[model samples]
Target chain A: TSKIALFDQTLIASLLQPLPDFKAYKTKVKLKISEQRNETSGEKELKFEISRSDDFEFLFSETLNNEKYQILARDHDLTVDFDAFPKVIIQHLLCKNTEINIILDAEKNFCSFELFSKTPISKGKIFSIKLHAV
Target chain B: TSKIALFDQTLIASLLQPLPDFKAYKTKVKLKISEQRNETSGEKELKFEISRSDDFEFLFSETLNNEKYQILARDHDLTVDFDAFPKVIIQHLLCKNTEINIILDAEKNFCSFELFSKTPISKGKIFSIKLHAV
Candidate 1:
């Protein structure tokens, strides 16, 4: 398949933030912000420009390169609206129960939690669920 | 009050992805990644480097700027760990529980949901959750 590094997927996943950088996954993006005014209304609208730089395909691609991982979103949560960019990251999710921890910020936007989720295959090791939203 | 918009906080909020730009509250981040090998083990380890940004403060900062919202994490779901980054974020949770959504990826990294809850005050508007994690 084309894989999960697409812009739409990234936006939906919300992984674009948090650990935005990982030597293993190498998921990275560049954002350019600009504003322009509407001639008729004379109102200014903001623009979000993104540049992708994820050479690595899926996060588990390198280690689990052979086997293909699938997405099970509808079975879990979140909706998909193409126009809604960062506000709705309809991209990545791994649905299963696991242990997790939470962090909070004074402003609330920086709040986060770490999912000490074990590998699906039942490895004693732990991967992370760095879910975040502003 | 010195509200949110911390680097680590912005790192945790997935909004850094979908709608990194907004007319109201701004939530954004920049990331850098690097690698090094454990000389003894001859294994490589990854490093996640992040830079914080969010001039506008909390997502609801502008409108709810006056009222200080409190988080009610333990009251809802997700466990909190001492080392955990303070993930219990149910500050302005709505009992009405409007439209909510979820997302996922092939690699199982980006798992997020959008809680399209009508504003508590509900004068005439709504907001979407743009949470993220690794």
Candidate 2:
């Protein structure tokens, strides 16, 4: 049986990288949930609208587990060195009055999502999807 | 002596992937020009600010070769299969009154920038960078 992977700095660094400027052009973001033992195997596509004033931010809303959540991010913290790993912290406020923190890998196109509640709504693996300019 | 590599659909497909939604969160994009013989071995970092309305587009202006250029993309064409490779075609309007086409791999974080003129301004390899949410 595969065990749950704990967060490791080096491992996360290996997978994490700085994101490109999506504000530089028209863009689209696609997402897929990795197949698990007992879960729905499919992908979801969302339209990514960005802010004209801030190059580092955008917003979207989704209904997960029958709860509507508004996700937003802005004023990002970026990597200092030449490698240039850009990242932002997003807040997911559920309509049911719950909040969760999502760590987005903007550069690498993957996310490390966090669930604070012991009774989580969804159980699956998170996969990274790259954006395409349309 | 390394010869110039022309456009290959398969090779490009392998490297190219779909991009994520920059509009869904605050995003930062960093760019670097890979080293080559007789060329400046360095990377250039630019601030990528995105728009709020459209998810698939952004814009930026840069001065290259003593010429200013406005780069923009929107209304993209996408791949049909499940592999999901998203792309956008950008038009670079140069201050020198010239235009060139740029193909961006939104998913893979690399861009295939084109120069139509026989006398090009810069020569180097294109690399991909992933975005991170702060």
Candidate 3:
């Protein structure tokens, strides 16, 4: 008889930081994540949310446009060009055994989330998690 | 007579991005900057502000603690080591003729803004600006 590995756990975390433009408003930025379970398999899903506000108004609206964004997950750190933004590196820290990265234009009207992880959780072991943003 | 270079202009820009945890909230992130005048000399000043919000709450508070964070401006792109967060790269993109960078810990309890620029604007020229965040 062989033993079974249980893969029925979820994790949640949040990364909060002040906006680079600290004088325009009076609020800090936040990124939150939660691990989702797969109904039929050992696979995992991650859900994300970003939020911001002014004195009494919402600064971001997802219903404004329809542009496709992308997220990428890799085993290694993503390389960046010399002219890239420093905040782009945030994706590196968010990775654990599984790596997740994102790609969007300057406007950020659309976004996609990418995630990656290796196989075999070593039976009853849990996946590591890290969440952050600039 | 050689004409003197003028450093009498101001630049303002914004860096907006979706939060990494894209499912937690319904808004994006934003950082804004404005160059200030040094009434006494050639020195320059930059003001910054970061903002975010939820359904009906303020997420960050500058009045909470008196921690002393730092900002660094260098002539070259700042190097990052492995096991670091990717969003940290946001500082590199904010730099230009004067490489400006920032330093704040995980909690972001405290923060500092740093700016740098080479001497001699070379007679009638303007400095460039690049602002962004994760």
Candidate 4:
């Protein structure tokens, strides 16, 4: 758990926040994690959009020291993207639309996602992964 | 429909974002409208909190010029607060626990609020009051 862990919690929390039900509703989430030798300013933000029509989307960005991942899951698709993350470990992340989306709960109409990393790259260790929906 | 009109649109839009519903589910919304010389930073933000048992709230802050107001509506009580706002215009704003809340729509379990200002306090005018629940 490190600096990116803080950003992870806030961003994922926004995704987990309950909203009015929408059929096959989904939107893409993006994350840009960069390393700065002497990074000074820390800016965190969460922007959202939704309606009775069921279209929901959000943009969450902040300053951090390691690579980050963005996840966007829908009734039929799931995507998890990262920047400069180790390729060897890519196998560990369930990227297929079906595998990654197994975390979705049909009755609740949301995703309950949990990702685990065997551990670090120092220059790029996992800061954290905290996501839940019910 | 002017500068406050723009702020009103964003602020009320957040309140309407759907969330997992809860019993007696309600929250207070606050707004601060002030007139300043050569104002610049137009920082807009939306912060949220919620759970299955249903305690959801948000703090939205931004900068503007005028006398703004805040609203805290509950199952049994409702309060709207304003600073340096004109007293003569106060009655039109509806300051009663019951009178002010005719907007609460049950069954669907949310409030449907609409406040109309018979318009100006120019030196102390209303930017906007937009709220909805469903």
Candidate 1 lDDT tens digits, B41-67: 644332333334442222121111101
**TM-score of chain A as modeled in candidate 1:** 0.23
Single out the weakest 10-residue window by summed lDDT for candidate 1 chain B.
Answer: B61-70
Candidate 4 segments exceeding 4 Å error: A1-15, A20-26, A31-33, A40-57, A62-134, B1-134
Instruction: Itemize residue pairs with steric clashes in candidate 4.
Output: B34-B65, B34-B66
Task: State in Å the error of residue B20, model 1.
Answer: 37
Stretches > 4 Å off in candidate 1:
A1-26, A54-134, B1-79, B82-134
Number of colliding residue pairs in each model = 39, 66, 35, 2
lDDT of 1 at B9: 22
Error of 1 at B30 (Å): 42
Candidate 3: docking tier: incorrect
User: Looking at every candidate separately, what fraction of the true A–B Cα contacts under 8 Å does it contain?
Assistant: 0.00, 0.00, 0.00, 0.00
Tens digits of lDDT, candidate 1, A17-40 = 333342222234343323344455
Residue A52 lDDT in model 4?
Answer: 19
Residue range with the least summed lDDT across 10 consecutive positions in model 1 chain A:
A61-70
lDDT of 3 by residue, A51-74 (tens): 444212212222100111111212
By lDDT, the better pick of 1 and 4 is 1
Report the error of model 3 at residue A96, Å.
28
TM-score of chain A of each: 0.23, 0.20, 0.26, 0.25
Q: Estimate each model's TM-score.
A: 0.18, 0.15, 0.19, 0.18
RMSD of 4: 22.9
